[PDB]
């Protein structure tokens, strides 16, 4: 920031493709999969909690 304010460096170009990244099928499906796996683990947490609160085992398949 000081180099830019002192004029010793050029401001960065927002449009330079060296400053950009292409979010392809893999990294996009990964974003989906993170959200969806988190939701799945949440649902598993509620389901298992409502069973262990009764002090008995539970079937992870269900």
């Amino acid at each position: 920031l000081l180099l830019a304010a002192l004029g010793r460096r050029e401001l960065d170009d927002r449009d330079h493709y060296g400053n950009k990244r292409l979010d392809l099928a893999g990294p996009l499906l990964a974003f989906l999969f993170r959200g969806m796996f988190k939701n799945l683990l949440k649902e598993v947490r509620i389901y298992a909690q409502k069973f262990i609160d009764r002090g008995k085992d539970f079937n992870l398949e269900l």
Binding site: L1, L2, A5, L6
Partner: protein
Amino acid sequence: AIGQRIVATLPYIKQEVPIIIVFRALGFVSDRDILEHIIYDFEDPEMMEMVKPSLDEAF
């Protein structure tokens, strides 16, 4: 006020924070240490006077 102040808009915080405050919150309280981390060439007074307002604002 007098000169140009450097601030830092941290996440999850809705108010600007001086950079020196952030450096001290990370364990670097001495101004020498903070400018050792910021200014790597102590022979350059231009950088120094441009960071000085931030120090003067956080004492």
